[PDB]
């Protein structure tokens, strides 16, 4: 019977630094992995208040993506051992965030460990000046490659003064044991900040994520 229950909790710890500013975050989350939604509460436990935009940290929990039965749910199937991911975010103004993560299931809940480093953000840019205010919905394009599941997305952070600040995101998600990979598909995601204290040292988020077949192009109908 099911390792991943219809309701699952998680704990997460991140160690990070952005433009030299070190910090740690601890959090706990919960959600319904087969329905595709989840929430999390994070606390900046060291290094607060952060001198940069929370939004670059917000996308740093793929067990909770709803999948139709005909798309292998590779990352759920990886449990209880779990999976790792590695991510590069290349922001439009040259800032770069790298992230590594380990996901496992221990004592009936998910355990997440994250390490993050951001560098090369302009001192007067929207990240270091805290001038973003959330992200738009996105669609992560998922595809098998090099024995892992890759995702590619273009994140759009909303600027306080209107307009967007963007990042090209590439992630590699790899099960700790060989698990059947899906074919290429798409995950529609929306992530909201649902609560924060005045200096964003306590932040709560809600995410909805659902996999579907790729829309495809007209060209493919002639194949
Ligand atoms: Zn039920
Ligand atoms: Zn500092
Ligand atoms: Zn609750
Ligand atoms: Zn310290
Ligand atoms: Zn289908
Ligand atoms: Zn735009
Ligand atoms: Zn709260
Ligand atoms: Zn706010
Ligand atoms: Zn205020
Ligand atoms: Zn084509």
Author numbering: 5 to 64, 69 to 231
Question: What's written in the study?
Answer:
Recently, three OFPs with novel phenotypes have been developed: permanently fluorescent LSSmOrange with a large Stokes shift (437 nm, 572 nm) and two proteins photoswitchable from orange to far-red fluorescent states PSmOrange ( 548 nm, 565 nm; photoconverted form 636 nm, 662 nm) and PSmOrange2 ( 546 nm, 561 nm; photoconverted form 619 nm, 651 nm).
LSSmOrange was shown to be useful for multicolor imaging, simultaneous detection of two Förster resonance energy transfer (FRET)-based biosensors using a single excitation wavelength, and single-laser fluorescence cross-correlation spectroscopy (FCCS) imaging of four FPs. Key substitutions in LSSmOrange responsible for its ∼135 nm large Stokes shift comprise I161D, M163L, and W143M enabling the excited state proton transfer (ESPT). These substitutions introduce noticeable changes in the nearest chromophore environment of LSSmOrange. X-ray structure shows that W143M replacement provides a shift of the side chain of L165 towards protein interior, and both W143M and M163L substitutions improve the chromophore planarity relative to parental mOrange. As a result, S146 acts as a mediator for ESPT from p-hydroxyphenyl ring of the chromophore to carboxyl group of D161. All elements of the mKeima proton wire are present in LSSmOrange (cis-chromophore) indicating to a similar mechanism of ESPT; this suggestion has been confirmed by site-directed mutagenesis.
